[PDB]
């Protein structure tokens, strides 16, 4: 059984190929949509269902932390809520009122801001 | 009130399937 290529829909006869996204590909049919590099071996990210390499992602495909306003590395974990996301860091995801870290705590969101408790939301008007 | 859930980064690795030489 030769593995089938999910891009060009034909079999791979080379003895080298790439596995990504649960699928097989000719080396040259899994490539950064932005800079065209061969993704094989390398870290990549699915943005709008096209694979991009790590530096293209960092350079034009965002995810900017609501707390510190810096990009969140696509390799590390992050906290999301609705359209928002924060580094999983005591500096980014904490209480707007009292600074209490909220990673894995109960919290209360109000647009961007985020609080540990009703009390804390009730200060901050 | 709700709970903070760590989600994983969207990055993955493209596995380079290739045999080892003699």
């Amino acid at each position: 059984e030769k593995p089938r290529c999910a891009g060009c829909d034909e079999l791979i006869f080379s003895n080298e190929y790439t596995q990504a996204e649960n699928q097989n590909w000719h080396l040259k049919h899994f490539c950064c949509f932005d800079c065209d590099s061969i993704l094989a071996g390398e870290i990549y990210v699915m943005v709008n269902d096209k694979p991009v390499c790590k530096p293209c992602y960092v350079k034009n495909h965002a995810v900017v932390c609501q707390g510190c306003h810096n990009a969140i590395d696509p390799e590390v974990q992050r906290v999301t809520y609705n359209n928002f996301s924060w580094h999983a860091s005591t500096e980014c995801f904490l209480c707007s009122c009292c600074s209490k870290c909220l990673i894995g705590q109960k919290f209360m969101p109000v647009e961007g801001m985020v609080f540990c408790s009703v009390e804390c939301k009730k200060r901050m008007s | 009130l709700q709970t903070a859930s760590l989600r994983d980064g969207p990055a993955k690795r493209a596995v380079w399937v290739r045999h080892t030489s003699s």
Binding site: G67, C68, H69, N70, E91, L94, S96, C98, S99, V110, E111, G112, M113, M124 | -
Partner: protein
Amino acid sequence: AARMSEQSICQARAAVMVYDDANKKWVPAGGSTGFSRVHIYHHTGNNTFRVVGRKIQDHQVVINCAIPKGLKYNQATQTFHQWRDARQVYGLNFGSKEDANVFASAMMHALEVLNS
């Protein structure tokens, strides 16, 4: 026409940032994470405006700058705004769309006055 002391023309809730160019990284102004109250002051006697932000937990002042006649005030996103001086880029991460809209208006108005 006016008066020899200063008064707030608006108030908004924002995390005040500076851009670290060495490290390519936005950092809290004054080196302390947290939201500030940011005011625009009008001094009608001299026709000057300044921005002042004191942290809310702390009252520590973390920004205090005259608003130059020339300012390009860039609304980079809907709730993050920024601008340079000679030595540096400064930003405000507003708490609500509302705090951004108010502050922006007030800024727009100060610049209009400062040219007018």
